[PDB]
Amino acid sequence: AVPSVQTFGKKKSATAVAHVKAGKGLIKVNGSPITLVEPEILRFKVYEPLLLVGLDKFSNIDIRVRVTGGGHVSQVYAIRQAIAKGLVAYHQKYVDEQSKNELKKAFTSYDRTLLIADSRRPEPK
Template sequence: MVDCVNTSGKRKTAIARAVVKEGTGRVTINKVPIEVFTPELARLKIEEPLGLVPEKAQNVDIAVIVNGGGVMGQAAAARTAIARGLVDFYKDEELEAVFRSYDRSLLINDDRRKLPKNPMGPGARAKKQKSYR
């Protein structure tokens, strides 16, 4: 175990930075305790890595700062940062295997991005229809 670990996670344009240190199990997202974080769906997504290893999550304090992107993008970035932080803090291959078997994106950033909009249409794929009659 290390004294303090800094990790990061990304999803679309959201970037999360997490600080994991020894403590009593407090988790904050942008200085808001996770118990009162809204919306609930995003909170449940962020809590996934903590629920997989509750005995290890009880012994650390995690502070996450997230900016950019939307609500769910920030939640996905935060959960990646938290999972990476726990793995780095405990330096445990078993813990890494648990996260990897549950969901690969807990440890690896999701590199999917939005397609750029093209001319002649409202979005990336849709085009204005043509009729020759």
């Protein structure tokens, strides 16, 4: 009976599942808050889906991210991709489509690796 939206972010072998539901405003990564993401010089890589679009988008939803695998920087990249596409998917589903593709324009103008990972590599030259 509650609205909930699950998305996935991935880098090299990291994986990050984000559950977005209608809540009080709390963002958690692996149970601890989002302000305790290590290695603390990439905390703004985690913070940029939030600050790109303002915390008033997040002030009614509460996200939680379970991250597994990879190393430090793979984990912060999977976290930020999960946060970004989770917020866009919640806005498609339970808020209006105008806000959904405004969020898509904001994240894609910053970098579209917040929404689409680079998936199949390499090249045979």
